[PDB]
Nucleic acid binder design. Sequence first.
DNA 1: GGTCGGCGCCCGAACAGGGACTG
DNA 2: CAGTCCCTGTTCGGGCGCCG
Lengths: 411, 555
Amino acid sequence: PIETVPVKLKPGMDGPKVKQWPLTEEKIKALVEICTEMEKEGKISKIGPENPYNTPVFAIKKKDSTKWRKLVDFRELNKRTQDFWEVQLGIPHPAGLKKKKSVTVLDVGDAYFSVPLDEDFRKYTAFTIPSINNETPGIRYQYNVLPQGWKGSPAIFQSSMTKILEPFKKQNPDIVIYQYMDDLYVGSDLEIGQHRTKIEELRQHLLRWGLWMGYELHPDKWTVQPIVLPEKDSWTVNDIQKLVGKLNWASQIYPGIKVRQLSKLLRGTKALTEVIPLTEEAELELAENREILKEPVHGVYYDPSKDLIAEIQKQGQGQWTYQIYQEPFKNLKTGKYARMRGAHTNDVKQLTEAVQKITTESIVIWGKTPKFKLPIQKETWETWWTEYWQATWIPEWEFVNTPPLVKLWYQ
Amino acid sequence: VPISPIETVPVKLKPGMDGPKVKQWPLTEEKIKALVEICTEMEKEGKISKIGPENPYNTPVFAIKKKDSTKWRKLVDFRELNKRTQDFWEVQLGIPHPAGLKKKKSVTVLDVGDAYFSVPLDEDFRKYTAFTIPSINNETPGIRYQYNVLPQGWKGSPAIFQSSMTKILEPFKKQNPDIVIYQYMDDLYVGSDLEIGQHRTKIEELRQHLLRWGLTTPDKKHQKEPPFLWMGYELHPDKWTVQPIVLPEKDSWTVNDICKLVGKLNWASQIYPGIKVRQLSKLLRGTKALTEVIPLTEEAELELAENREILKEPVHGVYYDPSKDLIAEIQKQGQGQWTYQIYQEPFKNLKTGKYARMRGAHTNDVKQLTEAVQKITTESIVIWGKTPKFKLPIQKETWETWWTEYWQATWIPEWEFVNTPPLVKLWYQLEKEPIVGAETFYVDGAANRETKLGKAGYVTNKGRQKVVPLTNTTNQKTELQAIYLALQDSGLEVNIVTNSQYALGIIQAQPDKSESELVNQIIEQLIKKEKVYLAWVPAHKGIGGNEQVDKLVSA
DNA sequence: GGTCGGCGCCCGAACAGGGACTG
DNA sequence: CAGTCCCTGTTCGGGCGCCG
């Protein structure tokens, strides 16, 4: 007996038409039990080939989670409905969430099943479940309620969500609550003990309205990875050539970098292993360049109308560096990840873990998911990335092949 | 017109477009009789109905012969209707494979006669399926019908049938869960671990369940005894094989004959191990006419004689056993060719295959091996839903050295080393640090865009120098040329400093084959060395001899 | 014959995006 | 400075195979 909020696509764009990729046996069995249960509860309903739209579907297991979780790759449908969840029913991003001592993520995706979906828009939520060895044709469904992983679900449920959080926000006016996709970010400066207690109060406060999980974050302990020059006492021709090449690349970001006096030490056609004493004019050019690398870049600020772009560089030995920017060489944040799961044995798992960590930071700081430039072949990523995904959202990505230049972001 | 028991599928046209209005082709008198005889029979059974002048739509119609039968098939040229009919999402995601079948006690295969003609069409859509049947006289106005079922040739007929057929089979599968029904169009593979007594009953229960919806299961197409003919294979109680493949024995080969030869060799490679179509596919490159006669090369005649000898011996595949692990083993066949076998017990292949795609202008064996592992993985997840364990002809230390040092993310699933030559290895290793006591070559090369003339050379720390003039070259070919000179004129250990990101990006990927002859000559020189250290410095910064050699190779 | 849908392979032409050099 | 071109990778169009 709930009225539906009318939803339309962006003008001049048809619905999504993305083929389903092969799924493993454990994933197909988990989707059949979930969809049959969702069909029994009226959440979904079978359709036919007269619906020309389709969206890929697979299943995941969150961190330290035994239960499977259905996930729909609504990245194409979210692009074709971008004007809805931004112009009409947007969500304000609290700038104080990133300054909390502890931030916890809650999966509230089960609440969106309580709200029905507009009848004219159900045609675009279609998805197909495959069968092993193509034993049976595709078993197609479509959503009758707000789908998990659709950017229009938290916008429609936002008015209902604020009224549920109003009694809790009143008693705790210092706690910041942000909602992105199927997740609820709750941050507070309280001690770690009483912080988890306030979470359980919010969990029971949400259970009495018809709704678990928990992933802890600490944004105040998020560090950045600056560009650092080596601190050598004896420099060789090879060291100075690598230093000049690194400072030449750094000059694209810090315009005050000079390599005039250092390159003068590379006049003769000397051997790479030969030791070179640093002149007086070169020791000052190196000390001044170290100071400029300490200063912040001039004119770097986040623009809400521009998309975020993230680049990841494989540094070996379980090390991974990254930078987030909207305009080139205007990095909003840099950093490095080390000793993640799959270190020293699996690159794809480390990259999948890195993308999830970077995306989570992009949500806490700016409230958007960046488009990734992944250092991996397309066929290598599309084969294994679903085996290591543990998040309810999926960012956009493209594939790059940039051989290492002068190892700029890692010593 | 009576109502069909099967629920219809609502079909629309694309918004803002009307039905087809095309004139009929001139038909031969032998096809006219074949159509009037079928049209008057489908009208009696309620599959087509007469229409008057109130239907302003029309589309051509013809008929082709059935294979190994005197009966004719009616087809409609719905090319104009398909353009304006709504888009459908096909539910046929792939093709089933016999290697993915499990051993069942009793097996039965049946076929539904005239599958499309047993499923009704949407009531509001029948008006757009109007056609004319010409009589034996050109002056006769002819009879006009409209379809009441799924026509053959319409782009929505296969998609509608597969989804309508699945909805009828769901209540039977829901009551009989242990029965395995492989549904592909009208072909129904029904297997069960039930005894042969209760199996015949369930088949007759299914033949009556399908009969309640207008789906006939004729005993002519019924199959009760092995070997079964299913999806183009021969299903035996313990093994399977493809139906007999016949390769043409042309004394003069055309381009279309090679395509039919390559197409059947690719189909044969799924169970016949060792099929190669490298030199035969080299006959199709740069060719324009399908009817152009092309002579067979010596490398293509040898490759054809080998594939003909493999097809002489009989091969058979087994069935999938979920209780034992899945194993895949790859072999480096030719230059750029790979073959693999998927099995659970030794020498009992579930299926075989080949991978030979050349990706990029520069590659090595480790990259191609990784691409093959990924092709086998995705293929295995389709058929069996799991990734097999791999037996790869690459040392464990060889792979550990590759992926740890490569700048891209790369990974291979759980695998083990099998010592089957030729092994896959890295043919050279660039040092991580400059080599002490090694001559340091500062190389550079440039060219002119207009004159296509350039220089390439080096200057070392021991006073050594060289400059070579080059004709019809580019800036990238000269910088590669300067590194090739430094490799030729140096000892076994050498440090090389360049300002070319292009030349450095190719060598660091450790290629062992390239489409460029200059790169292959650099590779052959790198294999002869013992220690090679490449380094990059920015140009125009007055760095070392890289400015002195830039001035020598400027023009 | 010159109908439809699906999947696979092989090729070339068109697209496209980055790096070094030039008015 | 924006305009090319040298190079390389991707995407798609079209032929064949196979199945219904």
